Amino acid sequence: TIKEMPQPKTFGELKNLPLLNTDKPVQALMKIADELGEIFKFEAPGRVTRYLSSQRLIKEACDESRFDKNLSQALKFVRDFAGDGLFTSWTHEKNWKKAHNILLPSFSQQAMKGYHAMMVDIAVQLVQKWERLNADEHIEVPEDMTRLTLDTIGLCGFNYRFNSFYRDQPHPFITSMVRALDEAMNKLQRANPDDPAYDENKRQFQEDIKVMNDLVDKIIADRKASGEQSDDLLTHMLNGKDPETGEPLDDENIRYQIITFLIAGHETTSGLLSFALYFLVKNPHVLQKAAEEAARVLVDPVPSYKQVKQLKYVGMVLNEALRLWPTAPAFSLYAKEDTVLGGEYPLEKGDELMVLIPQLHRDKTIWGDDVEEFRPERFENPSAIPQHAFKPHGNGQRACIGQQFALHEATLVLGMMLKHFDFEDHTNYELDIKETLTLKPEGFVVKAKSKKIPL
Amino acid sequence: TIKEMPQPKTFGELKNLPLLNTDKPVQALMKIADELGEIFKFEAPGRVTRYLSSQRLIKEACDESRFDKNLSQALKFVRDFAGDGLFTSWTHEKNWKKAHNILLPSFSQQAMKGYHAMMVDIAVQLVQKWERLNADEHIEVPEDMTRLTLDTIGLCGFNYRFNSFYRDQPHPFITSMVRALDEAMNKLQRANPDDPAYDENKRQFQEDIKVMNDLVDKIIADRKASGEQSDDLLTHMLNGKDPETGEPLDDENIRYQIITFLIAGHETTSGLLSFALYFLVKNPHVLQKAAEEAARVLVDPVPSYKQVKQLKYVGMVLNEALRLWPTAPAFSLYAKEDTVLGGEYPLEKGDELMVLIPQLHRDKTIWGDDVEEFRPERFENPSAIPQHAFKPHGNGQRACIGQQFALHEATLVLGMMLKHFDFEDHTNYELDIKETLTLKPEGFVVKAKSKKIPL
Numbered sequence: 001t002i003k004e005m006p007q008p009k010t011f012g013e014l015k016n017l018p019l020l021n022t023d024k025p026v027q028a029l030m031k032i033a034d035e036l037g038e039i040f041k042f043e044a045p046g047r048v049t050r051y052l053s054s055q056r057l058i059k060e061a062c063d064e065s066r067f068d069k070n071l072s073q074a075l076k077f078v079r080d081f082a083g084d085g086l087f088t089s090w091t092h093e094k095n096w097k098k099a100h101n102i103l104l105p106s107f108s109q110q111a112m113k114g115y116h117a118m119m120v121d122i123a124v125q126l127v128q129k130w131e132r133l134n135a136d137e138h139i140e141v142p143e144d145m146t147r148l149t150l151d152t153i154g155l156c157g158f159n160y161r162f163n164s165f166y167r168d169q170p171h172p173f174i175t176s177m178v179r180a181l182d183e184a185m186n187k188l189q190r191a192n193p194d195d196p197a198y199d200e201n202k203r204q205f206q207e208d209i210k211v212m213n214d215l216v217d218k219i220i221a222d223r224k225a226s227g228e229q230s231d232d233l234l235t236h237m238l239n240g241k242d243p244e245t246g247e248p249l250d251d252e253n254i255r256y257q258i259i260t261f262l263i264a265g266h267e268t269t270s271g272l273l274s275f276a277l278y279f280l281v282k283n284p285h286v287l288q289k290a291a292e293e294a295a296r297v298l299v300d301p302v303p304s305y306k307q308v309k310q311l312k313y314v315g316m317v318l319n320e321a322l323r324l325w326p327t328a329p330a331f332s333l334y335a336k337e338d339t340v341l342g343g344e345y346p347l348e349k350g351d352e353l354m355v356l357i358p359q360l361h362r363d364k365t366i367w368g369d370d371v372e373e374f375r376p377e378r379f380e381n382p383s384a385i386p387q388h389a390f391k392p393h394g395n396g397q398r399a400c401i402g403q404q405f406a407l408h409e410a411t412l413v414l415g416m417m418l419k420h421f422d423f424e425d426h427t428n429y430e431l432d433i434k435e436t437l438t439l440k441p442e443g444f445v446v447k448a449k450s451k452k453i454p455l
Numbered sequence: 456t457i458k459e460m461p462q463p464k465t466f467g468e469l470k471n472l473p474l475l476n477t478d479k480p481v482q483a484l485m486k487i488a489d490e491l492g493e494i495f496k497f498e499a500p501g502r503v504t505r506y507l508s509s510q511r512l513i514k515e516a517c518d519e520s521r522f523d524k525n526l527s528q529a530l531k532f533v534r535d536f537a538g539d540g541l542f543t544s545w546t547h548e549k550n551w552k553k554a555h556n557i558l559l560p561s562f563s564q565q566a567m568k569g570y571h572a573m574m575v576d577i578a579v580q581l582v583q584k585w586e587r588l589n590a591d592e593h594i595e596v597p598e599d600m601t602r603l604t605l606d607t608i609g610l611c612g613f614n615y616r617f618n619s620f621y622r623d624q625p626h627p628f629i630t631s632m633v634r635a636l637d638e639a640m641n642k643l644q645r646a647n648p649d650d651p652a653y654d655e656n657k658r659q660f661q662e663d664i665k666v667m668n669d670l671v672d673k674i675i676a677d678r679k680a681s682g683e684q685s686d687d688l689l690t691h692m693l694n695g696k697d698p699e700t701g702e703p704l705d706d707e708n709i710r711y712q713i714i715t716f717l718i719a720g721h722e723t724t725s726g727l728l729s730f731a732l733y734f735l736v737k738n739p740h741v742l743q744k745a746a747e748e749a750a751r752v753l754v755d756p757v758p759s760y761k762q763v764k765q766l767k768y769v770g771m772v773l774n775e776a777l778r779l780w781p782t783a784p785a786f787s788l789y790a791k792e793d794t795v796l797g798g799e800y801p802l803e804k805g806d807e808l809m810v811l812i813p814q815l816h817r818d819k820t821i822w823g824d825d826v827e828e829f830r831p832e833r834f835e836n837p838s839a840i841p842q843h844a845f846k847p848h849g850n851g852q853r854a855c856i857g858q859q860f861a862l863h864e865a866t867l868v869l870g871m872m873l874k875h876f877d878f879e880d881h882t883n884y885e886l887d888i889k890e891t892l893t894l895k896p897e898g899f900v901v902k903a904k905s906k907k908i909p910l
C-alpha cells in the first residue's frame with residue numbers, strides 16, 4: 001500500500017522554498033502540517049525533505065539502526081561558526097564520538113552536584129533583581145531568562161561571568177549570536193545566496209562571528225593563565241582523554257565546543273523558562289500547585305542539590321511546557337539504507353526527514369482531546385506514554401547531552417521564582433513566538449509581588 | 456589704607472568674560488588666584504564680582520551679620536529646574552526657612568541611624584559588582600561612584616530604587632542632569648545667550664529638565680500609592696510642619712526639593728569618593744593606614760552604624776580629599792550693608808563675593824608649606840583647624856544640610872572598598888578634573904584585587 005504524500009504549494013523553479021520567506025517559518029510549517037497531515041514533501045532547488053508530524057511515523061524515524069542524525073540546512077549554516085562541535089558534527093566524523101566520550105562525564109550526577117552552587121549564584125542574582133523593582137515596574141521575561149541562562153552556562157561551564165544582570169542591554173555575545181541566528185534563519189529561503197544583494201549580510205555575519213570568537217579567546221586565555229584549580233566543562237575540554245582514540249580534543253575543536261555550549265547551553269533553556277512562566281500565569285491552578293511544592297521543599301534560604309531533585313511537580317511543569325513549545329523545534333534525519341516508513345512511504349538510502357516536534361507533541365492519538373491544555377499531570381507516569389511521543393531533546397546517541405543541566409537549572413530557578421514571588425499577567429499577554437531557529441516568547445511581561453522571604 | 460584690587464586680563468568690551476570660555480573654569484580661576492593673590496576683581500558686561508582666596512578675607516565674608524548667601528550666575532541657571540528648593544532659594548524667601556525647619560530633622564543622628572541599613576544595601580551591591588569582575592577587567596571609578604551615590608539618596612531619601620548597578624549605561628536621570636549642569640556651566644561664558652547658535656542647547660536643556668521632572672513624578676506617585684509606611688526624607692517633605700509658620704511644604708516646592716536632593720544629595724559625594732580613591736592609589740603609605748583601619752574595625756560582614764563611626768582615619772582621608780578638591784568648589788555672598796573687607800576693600804550694599812574654596816584650602820599661612828601634599832594626618836586633631844579655614848560644606852545657616860549624610864555614606868563605602876579589595880593604578884592615571892559646576896575626576900580607572908572576604 002504505497003501512498004503518495006501531499007506537498008504544499010509550489011512556486012515554479014523555487015519549489016516550496018518561498019514558504020520559508022517569513023519570520024515564523026516553524027509556525028508556518030505547523031499550519032501546513034495541520035492541513036496536509038502526518039507527512040508532507042518539501043522541496044527546494046537541489047533538495048528534498050519530508051516533514052513528519054505523527055508519533056506513528058516518528059517512532060520509526062527514531063530507529064537508530066535505520067536513521068542517523070542529518071544536518072538540516074539550518075545546522076549547515078550554523079556550522080559556519082560552530083564547526084564540528086557536538087551539535088553540528090556528523091555522527092561519522094571522528095570528532096563527534098571523541099568529544100562525546102570526553103564531555104559525557106561533564107553531565108554526570110557528580111558533575112551536576114558540582115555545578116549547583118554556581119547555578120544558585122546566578123539564580124539569586126535573578127531573585128534580587130526582581131526584589132529590587134519598584135512598584136508597578138514589570139519584568140521583561142525572555143530578556144531576564146536569557147540573562148540568567150547565559151550567565152549560568154558561562155559560570156558553571158567556564159568560570160566566566162558575563163555579568164548579564166549588570167547590563168540593561170544584552171551582552172555583546174547575545175547581540176551577535178541572535179544576529180548570526182537571524183542570518184541563518186533568513187538564509188534558508190534565499191534562492192541565490194551569492195547574489196551581491198547579500199554582501200552586507202555576509203560582512204555582518206563574519207563580524208558577528210569574530211565577536212563570538214573573541215569572547216571564546218578570552219575564556220580560554222583566562223583559564224590557562226588562571227591560578228584557581230577548576231573542575232568544570234572547560235577543564236574536561238582541555239584535559240579529558242577519549243577512552244577509544246586515547247586523544248584529547250585539539251585546540252580548533254575546543255573552540256567550536258565552547259561556542260557550541262555557550263549557544264546551546266543557554267538559548268533553549270531561556271525559551272523553556274519563558275514558556276513555563278507564561279503557561280503558569282495563564283493557569284493559576286497549576287501555578288499554585290507548583291508554588292505549594294516550592295514552599296514545602298525549599299525550606300532553606302539557599303536551595304540544595306538534593307532539594308531541587310525533590311521538585312518533581314516543577315519538573316512536570318517544565319516537561320509540559322516543552323511539550324507545547326519545544327524550544328529547539330525540529331531535528332533532521334537521513335535513511336541509513338533503503339527502508340519503508342509506516343508501511344506506506346518507501347525511502348532510499350540518504351533520503352532526509354524533518355521531525356516537526358511541536359506538531360508531534362500535538363498528536364491527538366497520543367495525548368487525547370485536551371491536547372492544547374497545559375496539564376503537567378500528563379507526565380506523572382512515563383510508562384503510560386507511548387515510545388517516542390515526546391522528543392524535545394532529540395533522539396538516541398545524538399540526543400541533547402545537556403538535558404540534565406537544563407532541567408536542573410530550570411527546576412532550581414522556577415522553584416525559587418515560585419518560592420519568592422506571586423506573579424500577575426497584568427497585560428493579559430497575547431502569546432507571540434519569535435523564531436531564531438529556536439523558539440521564545442516575544443514581549444512577554446509580568447508583575448511580581450514579593451512574598452518577602454529572605455535569601 | 457584703601458587698596459586697589461588686581462584684575463586678570465581683559466578682552467575689550469567683553470571685559471573678563473572670555474576667561475570662562477573653557478571646559479575647566481574653576482581651575483582657570485584657581486590659576487588666576489595663584490597669580491593675583493587673595494582677592495581679584497572679575498568683570499563681565501553688566502556684572503562685577505570679587506574672588507576671595509585667603510582665610511583672612513573669607514572669615515570676614517563668613518560673618519553672617521555682614522554677608523548673606525548670594526545666587527551666583529551658576530545657581531541662577533540651575534534654579535531653572537531647582538526653583539526655590541533649599542540650594543537655590545534666597546535666605547529671605549519664605550520657602551527657605553520653612554523648608555529648612557521642616558527638613559533639618561531628616562538629618563538628625565536618629566535619622567542617620569535609620570538610613571544606615573539602606574546605605575549598606577547599595578554599598579554591598581557595589582562590592583558584589585567588583586567581586587564579580589573577570590580577570591584583568593577594570594573599574595570606571597566616577598561612573599560606579601555615581602551609581603552608588605544616586606542609588607543611596609534615592610533609597611534612603613525616597614524609598615525608590617534607581618537600580619543603577621543593573622545598567623551598563625548611566626541612568627537616564629544622570630545623563631540629563633549631567634547635560635543640564637554642562638549647559639549651565641557653558642551658559643556662564645556666553646556673551647550673547649540669544650544667538651541662534653544656542654537654540655538647540657536651549658531645546659536640549661528643556662528636554663533634560665523634563666526627564667528630571669518625569670522621574671520626580673514617578674517618585675511622588677510611588678509614595679502616594681505605597682501602602683507600606685515609611686519615615687524618610689520624602690515623608691518629612693509630604694507631612695512635616697514648619698513650627699514657625701505652622702505650614703507644610705506645598706506641592707510645587709516639594710517637587711523642587713526632590714530634584715534638589717536627588718542632585719545635591721549624590722553628585723558631590725560621587726566626586727568625593729572618586730577623588731579619595733585617586734589620592735589613595737597615588738599615596739600608598741596613606742592607603743596602607745586607611746586599609747589597616749578598615750580591616751580592623753569592620754569585623755562583621757555587614758558594617759554597623761557604630762563601626763562606621765570608628766573609621767576615624769578613613770574620615771580624615773575624606774576630609775583631606777575635600778581640602779584639595781572640594782567638589783562644590785565655590786559659594787557666593789552679597790554685602791548686606793556697606794562694609795569694609797579686610798580693612799582695605801570698601802564694599803557697597805549688594806556687592807557680590809565669590810569664595811574660591813580650593814584656594815582657601817591651599818592658604819599656606821593656615822596649612823603650612825606642604826599644601827599640595829595629600830596628608831590626612833592634618834585632620835588628626837580637629838580643634839587644631841582655625842575657624843573658616845576648611846569650608847567644603849559652605850557657611851552658617853546656609854551650610855550643607857546633608858554634610859553628615861555624605862560623610863557617613865562616604866566613610867562606610869570607602870571603608871568597605873578598602874576592606875574587600877587591594878587597588879592598582881594600572882594606567883598610572885593622570886588626574887583630569889571634569890567640571891560640571893561640580894568637580895570630578897574624568898577617566899579614572901583602577902584594577903581591584905579581591906581579598907576574598909565574604910559578605
Ligand code: HEM
Binds near residue numbers: 398
Ligand atoms: C530545554 C533546553 C534544551 C533543549 C530543548 C535542547 C534540545 C536539544 C535537541 C532537540 C538536540 C538535538 C538536535 C539535533 O538532533 O539536531 C540537542 C542537542 C544538543 N544539546 Fe541540547 N537542549 C537544551 C539545553 C541544552 C543545554 C543546556 C546544553 C549544554 C549544556 C545543550 C547541549 C546540547 C548539545 C551539545 C547537543 C548536541 C549533542 C550531540 O549530538 O552530541 N542543550 N539539544
Ligand code: HEM
Binds near residue numbers: 555786861
Ligand atoms: C561631599 C559632598 C557634599 C559637598 C562637598 C557639599 C557642599 C555643599 C556646599 C558648599 C553648600 C553651600 C552652597 C552655597 O552656599 O551656595 C551645600 C548646600 C547644600 N547641600 Fe551639600 N554638599 C555635599 C553633600 C550633600 C548631600 C549628600 C546633600 C543631601 C543629602 C546635600 C544637600 C545640600 C543642600 C540641601 C544644600 C542647601 C542648604 C541650604 O542652603 O539650606 N549636600 N552643600
Ligand SMILES: CCCCCCCN1CCC[C@H]1C(=O)N[C@@H](Cc1ccccc1)C(=O)O
Binds near residue numbers: 049
Ligand atoms: C538550532 C536548534 C534548532 C534547529 C531547527 C532547524 C529547523 N528549521 C528552523 C527554521 C525552519 C526549520 C526547518 O524546517 N528547517 C529546514 C528548512 C529547509 C527545508 C528544506 C529545504 C531547505 C530548507 C532546514 O533547515 O533544512
Ligand SMILES: CCCCCCCN1CCC[C@H]1C(=O)N[C@@H](Cc1ccccc1)C(=O)O
Binds near residue numbers: 892
Ligand atoms: C552646584 C554647586 C557648585 C556651584 C559652583 C559655582 C562656581 N562656578 C562654577 C564655574 C565657575 C564658577 C564661578 O566662578 N561662577 C561664576 C561665574 C561668573 C562670575 C562673574 C561674572 C559672570 C560669571 C558665577 O556663576 O557667577
Ligand SMILES: C=Cc1ccccc1
Binds near residue numbers: 082088260264267328
Ligand atoms: C541551539 C543550539 C545551537 C548550537 C550551535 C549553534 C547554534 C545553535
Ligand SMILES: C=Cc1ccccc1
Binds near residue numbers: 715718722783
Ligand atoms: C550640588 C548641588 C546642586 C543642587 C541643586 C541643583 C544643582 C546642584
